[PDB]
Design an enzyme around this catalytic site. Structure first.
Site, PDB file in Angstrom:
ATOM      1  N   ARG A 163      60.879  48.346  50.096  1.00 46.49           N
ATOM      2  CA  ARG A 163      61.697  46.995  50.507  1.00 46.49           C
ATOM      3  C   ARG A 163      62.641  47.268  50.542  1.00 46.49           C
ATOM      4  NH1 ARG A 163      61.017  48.453  44.966  1.00 46.49           N
ATOM      5  NH2 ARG A 163      62.514  47.181  43.622  1.00 46.49           N
ATOM      6  N   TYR A 164      63.276  48.566  50.171  1.00 41.94           N
ATOM      7  CA  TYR A 164      64.281  48.864  50.358  1.00 41.94           C
ATOM      8  C   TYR A 164      64.560  49.834  51.774  1.00 41.94           C
ATOM      9  CZ  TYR A 164      65.538  47.669  46.057  1.00 41.94           C
ATOM     10  OH  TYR A 164      65.370  47.406  44.427  1.00 41.94           O
ATOM     11  N   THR A 165      63.592  50.182  52.500  1.00 42.57           N
ATOM     12  CA  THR A 165      64.092  50.519  54.010  1.00 42.57           C
ATOM     13  C   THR A 165      63.646  49.939  55.554  1.00 42.57           C
ATOM     14  OG1 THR A 165      61.512  51.425  54.273  1.00 42.57           O
ATOM     15  CG2 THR A 165      63.281  52.658  53.219  1.00 42.57           C
TER      16      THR A 165
ATOM     17  N   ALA B 207      61.688  53.208  48.278  1.00 41.64           N
ATOM     18  CA  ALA B 207      60.588  52.018  48.418  1.00 41.64           C
ATOM     19  C   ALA B 207      60.808  51.075  49.511  1.00 41.64           C
ATOM     20  CB  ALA B 207      60.274  51.027  47.098  1.00 41.64           C
TER      21      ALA B 207
END
Lengths: 484, 485
Positions: free
Chosen positions: B89-91, B87
């Site tokens: 928000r996490y890369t 997702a």
């Protein structure tokens, strides 16, 4: 997530409204495309899906969803028949006027801020709201809470009644707040269910459509007209269910069914067969359709960070305690801000009274650091600002005693010296010089007034009350839902 | 959409890269969460679905997708087996170093800008790219174009060969650019298809996996090892198709199939039955699976706003012409900017040489407007900056009317110069700050002389362009991966 008892918001709602505030998407400025606000929310505050963010925005704009809309929307925001909103690149939004009251004084150190998802931005933990939003707009959540909306005039009157008498009973509060008030009007039936919910946090009531049997004067034929339906009922689905019941012969006596609703209002027409009795048909429709629904009031909200079942008085008390905290913090902030500015202005005034030696000093300084060193190395004569400068009431609380006015001389701080070095040449003109002196004198009066407010519990509580009264004048409206 | 021939981008890619530039999401700064870029893009430039914007970012970060990645990603950006990226928000992302070359001089009025969707923002119509990105990264689109990727050293060599000789033939260019170069290596078979595509814009080639038959010394058993597969083939899908063919008995002679690929490299292992011949099994796999694929080269791009089929020389010529336009515009811009700054610095120098009367004038002005009036009403003596200022007229802005500036030993200020004096902070009166302003002025005069040389000479202009291309080759050029047979 549960709403915070103080502002009635869940995180997603708070993130949306804050993003709109940071963008300057104000009630009195041009609308912006919804996509712009969505993109800002996704990027900085709620990185979880454009459609969920946009859905939040849409719901905040719909007059059949929110009793007091927080978003002023222009374009197609869907309907009570469950039609979808137009795509976010087409619709246009700005803050509702009332949303600005939810966020009043956000810039005045009135609420704690927390990190956003990546630690690059700050977000308020709660809004410094002048509006008792939890009660007036309500909340629901099934993962559980179910708070219905309320009339703002009534709820403000209940808040003021509590401030007047902290021992007020639930019965006493109900003289001001007799029950919920839905954006969609209609009728509430079950006064004891209301009282049970207000006393305990939980109670079940029933919501009923406003519907009448009409008789045609010339023919005697009967027609049921539905004018208002219960909160959260989808009109198209209600009409389909009625058609299905007629088809399955579970409800008899209906000859025709038509939606004649339009921009001007709701009007569901149900024609009655000649051999049937309208009242009997209508009573059967109430027993088998969403013309009547239950509403399980369950008043759960976050209070001191924990989920809590709260009664009506608990909720009001929490709101008022929030106002006390906000107004006290705001007034402390304004005092600090004024003292800090007055402190800078003293340095600028002293410098402008000593303009010749100041210029000479700076010109002969090899670098700004050496100029700053020279400015603070020896104190300055006060000149014609002696009377203006010479109470310790204007001194910042953080200022050490070796600084400021001392025995007819001014001892600068390094930050004051930097302010002098930052002065633009145009501040030497007569009007600009005079404006700085006038600002200093105004600040002294503002500081004295702020100290009088902080010194008086009566003054502070009056500020809280008067803000509530003003909300009632500016945003209070008529009750829509009849309570029976 | 078709890509623009000049920068190789479609609008969506251009909007993403521009948003990253505007955010300062630079190669030498901290990574930012992908969501931050996605939100900026959705809001300002491409208001059409977070997953489509993110999909574009992700592809631009994948080393099996782009020959020269335009996004530097940290985190899970998916795989050659078709795994999804984590997702947004996490890369975490920032511009690749080479992307900065794609956008070099964007702030220098080098390209036309157009309105975004709501008329509140501007977006470049095309990037002022120093990189021949259409050829090196390629393009595809089925709604049609299909341009394979190419080695940057080779393509820059071809550009330099065209600059040296505008009449160069396709054969001449192919001495520098023998064919495509895929990020995924492997082998191209069909030299005449390459030549046909370069000459005409269209030609069909075949891409073949790199695979070998190994024999066990102790036992004689044969195993096929696949080391590299064709561009755009999904390794997992390929392995599934092989299993299906074995199951349906359309390919015989396989005893086992295993993916032993890992971080160190691809390794697909296909064990051969004792009674089968490895080479025969492998030839059957090349005929029935994506161990070999066709690639229909179809070089269509937007040129002067219209779709067109372009040969290799057309593409190179368009890139070089773009560089000529960009460098000319850039030089005009820099000259204007330098003259404007030099003009302000003259005023500040003259004021600092006349500090006493300047202060007296300002102190006795009731308002800043009246001070401005007084500053411009009468000229100023030059003092010790006479020599610095008089010395051409080369440093005068083209818009400056003849009643202003240095005239017969005196300086005649404009209202904007007067405003700059009134805006001066007291700290500028110190020795160091004063000296910095004078040094900046003298540097600007040298820069102005050099910019005028470029504008005065087509040869000098082309030399700038050539030297920039040589520098790109030195900084970013790398080795060929794909073998041409």
């Amino acid at each position: 997530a549960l709403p915070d008892v103080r502002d009635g918001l869940k995180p997603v709602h708070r993130r949306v409204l804050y993003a709109m505030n940071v963008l300057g998407n104000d009630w009195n400025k041009a609308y912006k495309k919804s996509a712009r606000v969505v993109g800002d929310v996704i990027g900085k505050y709620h990185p979880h899906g454009d459609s969920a963010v946009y859905d939040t925005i849409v719901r905040m704009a719909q007059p059949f969803s929110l009793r007091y809309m927080l978003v002023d929307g222009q374009g197609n925001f869907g309907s009570i028949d469950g039609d979808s909103a137009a795509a976010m690149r087409y619709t246009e939004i700005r803050l509702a006027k009332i949303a600005h009251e939810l966020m009043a004084d956000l810039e005045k150190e009135t609420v704690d801020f927390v990190d956003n998802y990546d630690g690059t931005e700050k977000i308020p933990d709660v809004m410094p709201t002048k509006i008792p939003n939890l009660l007036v707009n309500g909340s629901s959540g099934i993962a559980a809470t179910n708070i219905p909306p309320h009339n703002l005039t009534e709820v403000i009157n209940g808040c003021l009644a509590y401030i007047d008498d902290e021992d007020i009973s639930i019965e006493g509060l109900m003289e001001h707040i007799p029950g919920p008030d839905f954006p969609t009007a209609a009728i509430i039936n079950g006064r004891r269910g209301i009282e049970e919910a207000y006393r305990t946090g939980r109670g079940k009531v029933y919501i009923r459509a406003r519907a009448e049997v009409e008789v045609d004067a010339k023919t005697g034929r009967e027609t049921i007209i539905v004018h208002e339906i219960p909160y959260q009922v989808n009109k198209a689905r209600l009409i389909e269910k009625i058609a299905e019941l007629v088809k399955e012969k579970r409800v008899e006596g209906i000859s025709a069914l038509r939606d004649e609703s339009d921009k001007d209002g709701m009007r569901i027409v149900i024609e009655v067969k000649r051999d049937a009795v309208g009242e009997v048909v209508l009573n059967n429709l109430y027993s088998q359709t969403q013309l009547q629904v239950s509403f399980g009031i369950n008043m759960v909200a976050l209070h001191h960070g924990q989920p809590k079942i709260m009664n009506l008085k608990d909720i009001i008390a929490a709101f008022v305690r929030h106002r006390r905290e906000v107004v006290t913090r705001r007034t402390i902030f304004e005092l600090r801000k004024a003292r800090d500015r007055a402190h800078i202005l003293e340095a600028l005034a002293v410098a402008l009274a000593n303009i010749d030696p100041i210029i000479e000093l700076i010109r002969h300084a090899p670098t700004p650091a050496e100029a700053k060193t020279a400015l603070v190395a020896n104190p300055w004569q006060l000149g014609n600002v002696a009377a203006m400068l010479e109470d310790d009431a204007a001194r910042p609380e953080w200022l050490e005693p070796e600084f400021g006015v001392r025995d007819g001389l001014y001892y600068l701080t390094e930050q004051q010296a930097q302010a002098i070095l930052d002065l633009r040449l145009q501040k030497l003109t007569g009007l600009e010089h005079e404006k700085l002196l006038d600002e200093y004198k105004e600040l002294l009066d503002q500081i004295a007034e702020l100290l009088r407010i902080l010194g008086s519990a009566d003054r502070l509580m009056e500020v809280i009350r008067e803000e509530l009264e003003l909300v009632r004048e500016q945003f209070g409206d008529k009750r829509r839902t009849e309570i029976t």
